[PDB]
Coordinates of C-alpha atoms and ligand atoms in Angstrom, one line a residue:
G174 CA 132.1 92.3 98.9
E175 CA 131.8 96.1 97.9
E176 CA 133.8 94.9 94.6
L177 CA 130.0 93.2 93.9
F178 CA 128.3 96.0 94.2
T179 CA 130.0 98.3 91.8
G180 CA 127.4 97.5 88.4
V181 CA 123.4 96.7 88.0
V182 CA 123.2 93.7 90.5
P183 CA 119.6 91.7 90.1
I184 CA 117.2 91.4 92.9
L185 CA 114.6 88.8 94.0
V186 CA 112.6 89.1 97.1
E187 CA 110.7 85.9 98.7
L188 CA 108.4 86.6 101.9
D189 CA 106.2 84.0 103.9
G190 CA 104.2 85.6 105.8
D191 CA 101.3 84.7 108.2
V192 CA 99.2 87.5 109.9
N193 CA 95.4 86.8 111.4
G194 CA 94.7 83.4 109.5
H195 CA 95.9 84.1 105.8
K196 CA 99.3 82.3 104.6
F197 CA 100.3 84.2 101.8
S198 CA 103.6 84.6 100.2
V199 CA 105.1 87.8 97.9
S200 CA 107.8 87.3 94.9
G201 CA 109.8 90.6 94.3
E202 CA 112.2 91.1 91.4
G203 CA 114.2 93.9 90.4
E204 CA 117.6 95.4 90.7
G205 CA 119.8 97.8 92.7
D206 CA 122.5 100.3 91.5
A207 CA 124.9 100.9 94.9
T208 CA 126.5 103.4 93.0
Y209 CA 123.2 105.5 93.2
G210 CA 121.9 104.2 96.3
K211 CA 118.8 103.2 93.8
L212 CA 116.1 100.1 93.8
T213 CA 113.8 99.3 91.4
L214 CA 111.3 95.9 92.2
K215 CA 108.1 95.0 91.7
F216 CA 106.5 93.0 94.4
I217 CA 103.4 90.4 93.7
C218 CA 101.2 88.6 95.8
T219 CA 101.3 84.8 94.5
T220 CA 98.4 83.5 97.0
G221 CA 95.6 86.0 95.8
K222 CA 94.8 89.4 97.9
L223 CA 97.4 90.3 100.6
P224 CA 95.9 90.3 103.8
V225 CA 98.0 93.7 105.0
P226 CA 98.7 96.9 103.6
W227 CA 101.1 96.6 100.6
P228 CA 103.2 99.5 102.8
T229 CA 103.3 98.1 106.1
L230 CA 106.1 95.8 104.6
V231 CA 108.1 98.2 102.3
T232 CA 111.0 97.9 104.9
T233 CA 111.0 94.6 105.3
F234 CA 111.1 93.6 101.1
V235 CA 118.1 95.4 101.0
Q236 CA 120.6 98.2 102.7
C237 CA 123.6 96.6 100.5
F238 CA 122.2 98.6 98.3
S239 CA 122.6 102.3 99.9
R240 CA 124.7 104.8 98.8
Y241 CA 128.2 104.6 101.1
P242 CA 130.1 108.0 100.5
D243 CA 133.6 107.5 99.7
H244 CA 134.4 109.3 103.1
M245 CA 131.9 107.0 104.6
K246 CA 133.3 103.1 103.1
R247 CA 134.8 101.7 106.3
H248 CA 130.8 101.9 107.5
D249 CA 129.6 99.7 105.4
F250 CA 128.4 96.6 107.3
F251 CA 126.1 95.2 104.6
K252 CA 128.2 94.8 101.4
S253 CA 131.3 93.8 103.7
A254 CA 129.1 90.7 104.7
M255 CA 128.9 90.0 100.8
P256 CA 128.7 87.4 99.0
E257 CA 127.9 84.9 102.4
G258 CA 125.5 87.7 103.3
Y259 CA 123.8 88.1 106.8
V260 CA 120.7 87.4 109.0
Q261 CA 118.5 90.4 109.5
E262 CA 116.0 90.5 112.5
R263 CA 113.3 92.3 112.8
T264 CA 110.3 93.4 115.7
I265 CA 107.9 95.6 113.9
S266 CA 105.2 97.2 116.4
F267 CA 102.6 98.8 115.7
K268 CA 101.2 101.6 117.6
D269 CA 97.9 100.3 119.8
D270 CA 98.3 97.4 117.6
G271 CA 99.7 94.0 116.6
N272 CA 103.3 93.5 115.7
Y273 CA 105.2 91.4 112.7
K274 CA 107.9 89.4 113.9
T275 CA 111.0 89.1 110.6
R276 CA 114.1 86.8 109.8
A277 CA 115.4 87.4 107.1
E278 CA 118.8 86.0 105.3
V279 CA 120.7 88.4 102.4
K280 CA 122.8 86.7 100.5
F281 CA 124.1 86.2 96.2
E282 CA 122.9 83.0 94.6
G283 CA 125.3 83.6 91.6
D284 CA 124.4 87.4 90.1
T285 CA 121.6 87.3 92.3
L286 CA 121.0 89.6 95.2
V287 CA 118.4 87.3 97.4
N288 CA 116.0 88.5 100.5
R289 CA 114.2 85.1 102.0
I290 CA 112.1 86.5 105.0
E291 CA 109.8 84.2 107.2
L292 CA 107.1 87.0 108.5
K293 CA 104.9 86.1 111.2
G294 CA 101.7 88.5 112.4
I295 CA 101.1 88.6 116.3
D296 CA 97.8 90.0 118.1
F297 CA 96.7 92.4 115.6
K298 CA 92.6 94.1 115.9
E299 CA 90.1 92.8 113.3
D300 CA 89.0 96.4 112.9
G301 CA 92.5 98.1 113.2
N302 CA 94.5 100.2 110.7
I303 CA 96.6 96.9 109.5
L304 CA 93.6 93.7 109.2
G305 CA 91.2 96.8 107.9
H306 CA 93.3 97.9 105.2
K307 CA 93.3 101.5 106.6
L308 CA 96.5 103.2 105.5
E309 CA 97.8 105.6 102.7
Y310 CA 99.3 104.3 99.5
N311 CA 102.2 106.0 99.7
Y312 CA 105.1 105.8 102.0
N313 CA 107.7 108.7 104.2
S314 CA 111.3 109.2 104.2
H315 CA 113.3 108.3 106.9
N316 CA 116.7 108.8 108.2
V317 CA 117.6 105.2 110.0
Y318 CA 120.2 105.2 112.8
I319 CA 122.5 102.4 112.6
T320 CA 125.4 101.5 115.5
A321 CA 127.9 98.1 115.7
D322 CA 126.9 96.0 117.7
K323 CA 130.3 94.7 118.5
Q324 CA 130.0 91.6 120.9
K325 CA 127.0 89.7 118.5
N326 CA 130.0 90.5 115.3
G327 CA 127.4 92.8 113.3
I328 CA 125.1 95.9 113.3
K329 CA 121.3 97.3 115.1
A330 CA 118.5 100.1 114.3
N331 CA 115.7 101.1 115.4
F332 CA 113.3 103.5 114.3
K333 CA 109.5 104.4 113.6
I334 CA 108.4 104.2 110.6
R335 CA 105.7 106.8 110.1
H336 CA 102.1 104.8 108.2
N337 CA 99.5 107.8 107.1
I338 CA 96.5 106.7 108.2
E339 CA 93.1 107.5 106.0
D340 CA 91.3 109.0 109.1
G341 CA 94.4 111.7 108.7
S342 CA 96.7 110.7 111.1
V343 CA 99.6 109.0 111.3
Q344 CA 100.3 105.7 112.9
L345 CA 103.7 104.6 113.8
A346 CA 105.9 101.4 113.3
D347 CA 108.5 100.4 116.3
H348 CA 111.0 98.9 114.6
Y349 CA 113.9 96.9 116.3
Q350 CA 116.7 95.6 113.7
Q351 CA 119.7 93.4 114.2
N352 CA 121.9 92.1 111.9
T353 CA 124.5 89.7 112.1
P354 CA 127.0 88.2 108.8
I355 CA 126.2 84.1 107.5
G356 CA 129.6 83.6 106.9
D357 CA 132.9 83.7 109.3
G358 CA 134.6 86.3 107.3
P359 CA 135.6 89.5 108.8
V360 CA 133.2 92.3 108.0
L361 CA 133.2 95.8 108.7
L362 CA 131.5 97.3 112.0
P363 CA 131.0 101.2 111.7
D364 CA 130.8 104.3 113.2
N365 CA 127.5 105.6 114.5
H366 CA 126.2 107.0 111.6
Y367 CA 122.2 106.9 109.5
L368 CA 121.1 105.4 106.7
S369 CA 118.7 108.5 104.4
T370 CA 115.8 107.0 102.7
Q371 CA 113.2 107.8 100.3
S372 CA 110.2 105.7 99.0
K373 CA 107.8 105.8 95.9
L374 CA 105.0 103.5 95.9
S375 CA 102.8 102.8 92.5
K376 CA 101.0 100.6 90.3
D377 CA 101.3 98.8 87.1
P378 CA 98.7 99.6 85.0
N379 CA 99.0 95.8 82.8
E380 CA 99.3 93.9 85.9
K381 CA 96.4 92.0 87.3
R382 CA 97.5 90.3 90.3
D383 CA 97.7 92.1 93.6
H384 CA 101.4 94.0 93.7
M385 CA 103.2 97.2 94.4
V386 CA 106.0 99.1 92.3
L387 CA 108.4 100.2 94.8
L388 CA 110.9 102.6 93.7
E389 CA 114.0 103.6 96.4
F390 CA 117.0 105.8 97.2
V391 CA 119.1 105.3 100.4
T392 CA 122.2 107.0 101.4
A393 CA 124.5 107.0 103.6
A394 CA 124.9 109.5 105.8
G395 CA 126.0 111.8 108.8
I396 CA 130.2 111.6 109.0
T397 CA 131.0 115.0 108.1
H398 CA 133.5 117.2 110.4
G399 CA 136.3 116.0 107.9
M400 CA 134.9 117.0 104.6
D401 CA 133.3 120.1 106.0
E402 CA 136.9 121.3 107.0
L403 CA 137.9 121.0 103.1
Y404 CA 135.9 124.3 102.4
Ligands
LDO729 N1 136.0 125.4 104.7 C1 136.3 126.5 105.6 C2 136.1 125.8 107.0 C3 135.7 125.2 107.7 C4 135.3 125.6 108.5 C5 134.8 124.9 109.9 O1 135.6 123.3 109.5 C6 137.8 127.2 104.6 O2 138.7 126.8 103.8 O3 138.2 128.1 105.6

């Protein structure tokens, strides 16, 4: 599977969502270059205005594009599941507000890596930071710890995303994530490690539709003692 990621790979993201009486769809396109852990993606809301803030969907919108160091190649579950792919399921709980439930399948369709997502939003406050669009349009860097779930033949992660709010506070979005292979081909089940992520959000000055431009870099890390010994 890792052979499929040696070059630049086109990406398609499709999300079907339902939150607070609003059905919405998002399509995203761009490319990933796993050699540098680099993602360049532009998302468009094709149904009108997005009924939740763009930053709340960044994690939902392809960790197979993470840069795994040579010394950590045996820990890359995500690429090992390719091309048949993996299911990624999350609960995202917004502190003192509602939650997202997401299920995605990530797999190749020919040369294109496709992330197809179903999202449901539950129990949000009409006046809250999410439905009230009170999040700043920016994004923090996070370290996501990955552990094996070997009886389920996959991996899991839980992590809290920090969203800056326009009132100067920071609202946490608590993520619980599980990934399972779609195919029956053996996958790599990793030792504990983490993914170091950084994301920049911007706008296309020629785009009339509601949209988000995302530039993201992800690097696997945390396995250091063996390499440190060399020096
Ligand atoms: N590279 C050092 C050893 C690192 C000490 C911790 O492993 C050296 O060559 O002396």
